[PDB]
Structures are given as structure tokens and as C-alpha cells.
């Protein structure tokens, strides 16, 4: 028997308390991993002109106020619309660097981990959305052909950069939700 279960050992269901506790840890690891995965690209390769991320079409709460104003239910629907959108690009990233790219500095290392953990964390998302029953549509990744050295390096840049931008949103939201629902303290 696991520490939080009683009455019926069967079905059981993992308490919310430590269901976030695991998901927070991941989004924390991911951003704090794609953050240095970026810092290694920049140093080793690079101008910046990028006001274009695929995740901008979404109704993202981009203030502290706007966040404290958004419906908890819709915040998860939000959080998972991002993660999902991030899945495709992350597989091009890993295959492209890995593959027909005569492999450079092993940013790769950091990018594989990120692809795993992401998807790991995403299923912990569907589980937490499953517990608070209301899936919806998510923003399409178009910079496929983008993935010249000056122009292609800039496309890598933009992608890499948004990962750092979004994985922060995501992580920062789960910090919120976990600390709104569980303890509002």
C-alpha cells in the first residue's frame, strides 16, 4: 500500500498535492535546461531581431494581474495548448541537429533530455486535466523549411529563444496553480 491510500487500495488515484509536486519539478528542470541550452548556442554561434513566436496567437496572461484574473480550469487548458504545440518542433530540432548536420558542440545532449522530459511532463498534464474534467486546438508550428548559414542560424535562434520564453511561462504558471489550489498560503 502507498502512503496516501486507504479505504479502497484499488482505483486509488494519486492525490493532487503531489501530482503537481512532480509536474512543477519537471517544468522547472526543462526551462532551467533549455535556458543553458540557449546560452551555449548564443556563445558558440552569435544579432537578434525576432518578434515572432508561434505561441503568440494564444490568449496568454502576460502580467501578474492578468494571471490572478484567469480561471484555474482554463489555465490548464492553456498550459497544455503550449506543451502540445512544442512537441513537433522539438522533434525536428533533435533530428536535424542529430542528422544531416555534421554534428557540432553537443547542445544535442541537452535537446534530447528536453524532448523526453517535455513529453513526460505533458502526460502528467493530461492526467491533471483528467482529474478536473471540463482537449482543444493548439497553434501550428510553421518554421519547418527554416530548420544560407546566416539565415538558417537565425531560424535556429528564434526557435531556441521561444523555448526559453515559453518554458518559463509554463513553469511560472504551475508554480502559480500549485500554490493557488493546494496551498493558497
Amino acid at each position: 500500500h502507498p502512503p496516501y491510500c486507504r479505504n479502497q487500495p484499488g482505483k486509488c488515484q494519486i492525490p493532487l498535492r503531489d501530482l503537481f509536486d512532480r509536474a512543477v519539478v519537471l517544468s522547472h528542470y526543462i526551462h532551467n535546461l533549455s535556458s543553458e541550452m540557449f546560452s551555449e548556442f548564443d556563445k558558440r554561434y552569435t544579432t537578434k531581431a525576432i518578434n515572432s513566436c508561434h505561441t503568440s496567437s494564444l490568449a496568454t496572461p502576460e502580467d501578474k494581474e492578468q494571471a490572478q484574473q484567469m480561471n484555474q480550469k482554463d489555465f490548464l487548458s492553456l498550459i497544455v495548448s503550449i506543451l502540445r504545440s512544442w512537441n513537433e518542433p522539438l522533434y525536428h530540432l533533435v533530428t536535424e541537429v542529430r542528422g544531416m548536420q555534421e554534428a557540432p558542440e553537443a547542445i544535442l545532449s541537452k535537446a534530447v533530455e528536453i524532448e523526453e522530459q517535455t513529453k513526460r511532463l505533458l502526460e502528467g498534464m493530461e492526467l491533471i486535466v483528467s482529474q478536473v474534467h471540463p482537449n482543444e486546438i493548439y497553434p501550428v508550428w510553421s518554421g519547418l523549411p527554416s530548420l544560407d548559414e546566416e539565415s538558417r542560424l537565425s531560424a535556429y535562434y528564434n526557435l531556441l529563444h521561444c523555448l526559453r520564453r515559453d518554458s518559463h511561462k509554463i513553469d511560472n504558471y504551475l508554480k502559480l496553480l500549485k500554490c493557488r489550489i493546494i496551498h493558497n498560503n
Binding site: K64, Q68, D171
Partner: protein, 203 residues
């Protein structure tokens, strides 16, 4: 014979709470006339130029952004205009997003207790609380911590990370020594603050 302003240098930006931020520039040469400065900036996506709201709050040569005008996960294209009586010049535009420019003030109410526990065990219990400004209760803001302590006269400090725990227990202290103790705080992700006001203890 009397020159235009030269060129203002804005490089440093900081946000101590993830709600409001603040920017400091470097006046140009100035020519030989009195020079009056102003600041315009553009938010990512939009193509609207705005004017700084608060010149006074962060002091001299500073622009302060209240919560209203501050907004994270945006990339501010900040540019400042030195404008003297005979001519005028801009700064080399700067791209600041509120996200990765965080840097809090240090921890407060650093209190330091001795407690004896279960059987021949006397631990030094380090307690303290985060800066009144920072919103860690709503989870918006997330603090990690570190402490360092050394005996009054010494050569090296010891360092203990204590991520987001606002208390810590220390077990290696030769009794009767006057130790010194300080605290400093990284955010979620960001810049470590300066150390805190130190306390000491002795046993």
C-alpha cells in the same frame, strides 16, 4: 562651436519583483549646453511608440515602470533621446524583456536559534523571511536561498543552498565559537542579490 548632445548609453536594467521594472541611462558628453533627456520604447508585436511614465521614482537618470506598464514575457525595445538646445541624438536601441532581468533585495528578519534535539544533538536553526515586496505567497514569485557562515575571525565561509526553504539546520559548529551568518536570494531563475545584514551567535 557648441556641439549636439553626443550619445546616451542605456545598458543596465533590473526588476526586483517581477511586477515592476526600472532602467538607468548614461548621459552623453552633453556638448556645452544644458541637456534634457526623455525615453521612448516599443512593446513586442505592437508598432506603437510610448513615453516613459515615471522619471522620478527610481531617481536620477532612471525610468520606473509601475505594474500597469510592466509586463513579463515581452521584449521591450527601449531607446533614450538626449536633446540639448542645439541639435539632438538617440541611443543605440536596447532590447530588454522583463523576464530574465530579475534581482531582488536581500532577506530580512534573519533570526538564529539554538535547539537541542533527540539525544546528544544540538543543531543551529537558521530562520528568516523573504523581502516584503516579493509575492511568493501567490506563487508568482519563487525564491531560492543560500546561507554562508564562518567564525568571527576566519578566512573562508561555508555555503549552504536551501532552495525555497525559509529555514535551515546546521550541524558542524565547534561549541562556544562566535559564528557569523548571512543570507542571499536567487529567484526562480535570475540574479543573486547582495548578502543580508549579518547576525551572530555563540554557545
Amino acid at each position: 562651436m557648441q556641439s549636439p548632445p553626443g550619445k546616451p548609453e542605456i545598458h543596465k536594467c533590473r526588476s526586483p519583483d517581477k511586477e515592476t521594472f526600472t532602467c538607468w541611462w548614461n548621459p552623453g558628453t552633453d556638448g556645452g549646453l544644458p541637456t534634457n533627456y526623455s525615453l521612448t520604447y516599443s512593446k513586442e508585436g505592437e508598432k506603437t511608440t510610448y513615453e516613459c511614465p515615471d522619471y522620478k521614482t527610481s531617481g536620477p537618470n532612471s525610468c520606473f515602470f509601475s505594474k500597469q506598464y510592466t509586463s513579463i514575457w515581452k521584449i521591450y525595445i527601449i531607446t533614450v533621446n538626449a536633446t540639448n538646445q542645439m541639435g539632438s541624438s538617440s541611443s543605440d536601441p536596447l532590447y530588454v524583456d522583463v523576464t530574465y532581468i530579475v534581482e531582488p533585495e536581500p532577506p530580512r528578519n534573519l533570526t538564529l536559534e539554538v535547539k537541542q534535539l533527540k539525544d546528544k544533538k544540538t543543531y543551529l536553526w537558521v530562520k528568516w523571511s523573504p523581502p516584503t515586496i516579493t509575492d511568493v505567497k501567490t506563487g508568482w514569485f519563487t525564491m531560492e536561498y543560500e546561507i554562508r557562515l564562518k567564525p568571527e575571525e576566519a578566512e573562508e565561509w561555508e555555503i549552504h543552498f536551501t532552495g525555497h526553504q525559509t529555514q535551515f539546520k546546521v550541524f558542524d559548529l565547534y561549541p562556544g565559537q562566535k559564528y557569523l551568518v548571512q543570507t542571499r536570494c536567487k529567484p526562480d531563475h535570475g540574479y543573486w542579490s547582495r548578502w543580508s545584514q549579518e547576525s551572530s551567535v555563540e554557545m
